[PDB]
Scaffold this active site. Structure first.
Site, PDB file in Angstrom:
ATOM      1  N   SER A  52       7.632 -11.004  -0.156  1.00 18.25           N
ATOM      2  CA  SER A  52       6.554  -9.955   0.650  1.00 18.25           C
ATOM      3  C   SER A  52       6.470 -10.412   1.987  1.00 18.25           C
ATOM      4  O   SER A  52       5.621  -9.691   2.857  1.00 18.25           O
ATOM      5  CB  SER A  52       5.103 -10.020  -0.020  1.00 18.25           C
ATOM      6  OG  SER A  52       5.160  -9.070  -1.258  1.00 18.25           O
ATOM      7  N   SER A 110      -0.885  -7.588   0.641  1.00 21.30           N
ATOM      8  CA  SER A 110       0.336  -7.560   0.040  1.00 21.30           C
ATOM      9  C   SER A 110       0.570  -6.382  -0.996  1.00 21.30           C
ATOM     10  O   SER A 110       1.354  -6.746  -1.975  1.00 21.30           O
ATOM     11  CB  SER A 110       0.863  -9.005  -0.546  1.00 21.30           C
ATOM     12  OG  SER A 110       2.085  -9.414  -0.254  1.00 21.30           O
ATOM     13  N   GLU A 146      10.143  -2.381  -4.049  1.00 18.42           N
ATOM     14  CA  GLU A 146       9.101  -3.151  -4.730  1.00 18.42           C
ATOM     15  C   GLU A 146       9.234  -2.488  -6.206  1.00 18.42           C
ATOM     16  O   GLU A 146       9.489  -1.373  -6.407  1.00 18.42           O
ATOM     17  CB  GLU A 146       7.941  -3.212  -4.383  1.00 18.42           C
ATOM     18  CG  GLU A 146       7.647  -3.705  -2.919  1.00 18.42           C
ATOM     19  CD  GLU A 146       7.489  -5.216  -3.028  1.00 18.42           C
ATOM     20  OE1 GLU A 146       7.263  -6.191  -1.906  1.00 18.42           O
ATOM     21  OE2 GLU A 146       7.702  -6.032  -3.898  1.00 18.42           O
ATOM     22  N   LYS A 214       1.873 -14.019   6.927  1.00 24.07           N
ATOM     23  CA  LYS A 214       2.311 -13.232   5.610  1.00 24.07           C
ATOM     24  C   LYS A 214       3.030 -13.807   4.693  1.00 24.07           C
ATOM     25  O   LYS A 214       4.100 -14.612   4.823  1.00 24.07           O
ATOM     26  CB  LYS A 214       3.225 -12.277   6.270  1.00 24.07           C
ATOM     27  CG  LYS A 214       3.476 -11.075   5.154  1.00 24.07           C
ATOM     28  CD  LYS A 214       2.180 -10.337   4.621  1.00 24.07           C
ATOM     29  CE  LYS A 214       2.506  -9.797   3.206  1.00 24.07           C
ATOM     30  NZ  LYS A 214       2.086 -10.733   2.095  1.00 24.07           N
TER      31      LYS A 214
END
Length: 269
Positions: A52, A110, A146, A214
């Protein structure tokens, strides 16, 4: 002092070697002090699955590519677009969300559907890769959406980058003259104060130093964090720390990232 610096690098390097042994992991580190251009580097050019961590770079590319008005247009995605772990986008299915809201959900929480929408906005994973090439990143290779992009299979180049490439990209968007002032400040604020970063680079920072990050997590124990670190009365430090382990279902330990960050921030201090 050339003898002096390299013995300091050997000492810093041995700490990373010992962390790999202690946590049964492979570690990749690249950090640069924006005020001095001093760097810390450990396997800086080896590939890891980025997981991510791409979400902050994809949000930045979306900001660069789209007008303020465009970034406020509502995107009406459907229940069919929801993938595993979409805590924000699943809430607003009736209402839809703007690219600006999607970007914030991707970075702060996320949200995986948010990440997919950003990838789609850029032309898919290949268009995201093209956006990174435009800021001089010819290393990162983006292929899948994803959640498949988290598979982190040994030797697999799909959806990988290096600690040096990811740090340099994060620097390009947050600190270099790549985004307009307003877009750079918006992107930076999205990175601040998020619980997903609490046990990672933030947990290794000295008292008083703020971390905007992140995080990333994937299979084969992949556990990543990329960040900008603001020490009191000092220029920012950009830090990428990537890691994985050696079996598909391996559990990561957040303390590896925190302890790696302590080395970085204590030796750039």
């Amino acid at each position: 002092s050339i003898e002096d610096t390299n013995m300091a690098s050997c000492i810093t390097n041995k700490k990373f070697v010992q962390l790999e042994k202690k946590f049964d992991a492979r570690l990749g580190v690249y950090a640069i002090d924006i005020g001095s251009n001093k760097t810390i580097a450990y396997r800086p050019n080896e590939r890891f699955a980025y997981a991510s961590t791409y979400k902050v770079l994809a949000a930045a590319a979306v900001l660069k590519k789209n007008s303020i008005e465009k970034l406020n247009e509502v995107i009406h995605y459907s229940k069919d677009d929801l993938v595993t772990y979409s805590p924000i986008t699943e809430k607003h299915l009736d209402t839809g969300m703007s690219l600006k809201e999607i970007s914030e959900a991707a970075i702060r929480y996320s949200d995986n559907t948010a990440g997919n929408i950003l990838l789609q906005q850029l032309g898919g994973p290949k268009g995201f890769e093209k956006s990174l090439k435009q800021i001089g990143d010819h290393v990162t290779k983006a292929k899948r959406f994803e959640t498949d992009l988290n598979s982190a299979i040994p030797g697999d180049i799909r959806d990988t980058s290096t600690a040096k490439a990811l740090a340099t990209d994060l620097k390009a968007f947050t600190l270099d003259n790549t985004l307009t002032t307003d877009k750079r400040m918006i992107l930076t604020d999205w990175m601040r104060g998020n619980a997903t970063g609490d046990e990672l680079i933030r947990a290794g920072a000295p008292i008083g130093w703020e971390v905007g990050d992140k995080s990333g997590a994937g299979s084969y124990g992949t556990r990543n964090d990329i960040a900008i670190v603001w020490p009191p009365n000092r220029a920012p430090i950009v830090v990428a720390i990537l890691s994985n382990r050696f079996t598909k279902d391996a559990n990561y330990d957040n303390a590896l990232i925190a302890e790696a960050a302590k080395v970085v921030l204590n030796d750039l201090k």
